[PDB]
Structure 1
């Protein structure tokens, strides 16, 4: 017979669509080795939907792009994810590099719709103030946005983590720097101040910081 005997157990983690396909692959491989008893249940959803689930205790922690409105939650920024622009190789002549927005054709910049934090962050960080350059047809996923650019329709902003995870493979695209300063989005972890798992969240934040 036999005697009866913080990174252990289960965590529900939410993440936005322009981070989840890229960073979480790396996170899972790292936790598999470093914290092998941590089971990560995952939810992918829009920022607003994730925040409601977090408030309601249906998720334990989120990985978001910041800043977004998160009053009342606790957050920790863990790294920065640069922005690049992309154009098709076939269009690399009709678009001059360095990019100057005023020299692009009207309606040549394609962006995700507003439920997506990528648009507010890229437009502000990359200083796109001329609304006439934005195409009126809004994209609904980062993959289909990049495919429209690959079809030669114009240009857009892409996060570095997507490039590093092969999003552009086999689509014959060229990666360019956005005009002006080096531009980026902050990545952070967000959780409830009342949570009893903040030791877990801070260890997780250290792990994620090493992947960015």
Structure 2
């Protein structure tokens, strides 16, 4: 049995894709997902309670390697009552500070960088925008798991458009290493190929 870990910002979008692959390509191994924050993921890889983690960054912590899986682009999610609804692309510096939502843990880190509700959860903000009040950002992978009436309510970023990088982070002192290779290959296989090679116009 192995135990993979995942961040709330990736889990609900990746997992629905990956689970079937775990049944076919591996064959019955007691795998289970465990949702956890980016900071606790790392600490738990070190502590030994967890064996593997799909995280949003590199580790940069002794005793942890981290191999890259794929790239996932941030996109604007702009509510109906905004002046941005008219534009077809998010100008990085034409937004309003008194209506954006964000989560400390990898989502604000990349977005607040250039930019009354803390401890949030993706869906809540995503719904506020659907309601017609505010803006929030979203991982590209998610936009296609939206109803058609939902999808019209997204807008791409303007080049150079910001992007995060999902990666699988593990501890150097790992026993079954054979697997780390297997799992890495499957996870990259879980998402389409089109967002695996950094194209022109992506600068973190």
Residue 108 of structure 2 aligns with which residue? Answer: 119
Mapped to 2, the partners of 1:201 and 1:175 lie a distance apart of 35
Inter-CA distance 143–137: structure 2 relative to 1 (3 Å threshold):
same
Q: Report the Cα distance in structure 2 between the residues aligned to 1:59 and 1:24, rounded to whole angstroms.
A: 17
Tell me the residue number matched to 1:5: none
Q: Cα gap change, 1:183/1:103 in structure 2, threshold over 3 Å: closer, same or farther? A: closer
What secondary structure, in the 3-state scheme, does the structure 1 residue paired with 2:30 have? strand
Give TM-score scaled by structure 1 length. 0.80
Could you state the TM-score of these two structures normalised by the residue count of structure 2? 0.83
How many residue pairs get aligned? The number is 190
* 1:107 shift after superposition: 1.1
Q: How does 1:124-163 map to 2 (within 5 A)?
A: 124=113, 127-128=114-115, 136-138=116-118, 140-163=120-143
> Where does the alignment leave 5 or more consecutive residues of structure 1 unmatched?
1-9, 129-135
Q: RMSD across aligned C-alpha pairs, in angstroms?
A: 2.2
Q: Which structure 2 residues correspond to residues 1-212 of structure 1 after superposition, within 5 A?
A: 10-67=1-58, 69-88=60-79, 90-91=80-81, 93=83, 95-97=85-87, 98-112=89-103, 114=104, 116-124=105-113, 127-128=114-115, 136-138=116-118, 140-166=120-146, 171=150, 174-212=153-191
Alpha-carbon distance in 2 for matches of 1:102, 1:183: 13
In the alignment, the residues of structure 1 paired with residue 109 and residue 18 of structure 2 have an alpha-carbon distance, to the nearest angstrom, of 26
Long gaps (5+) in structure 2: 192-204
Residue 92 of structure 2 contacts residue 157 of structure 2 at CA under 8 Å; is this kept in 1? no
The list of structure 1 runs, each at least 4 consecutive aligned residues, that deviate by more than 4 angstroms after superposition, is 92-96, 168-173
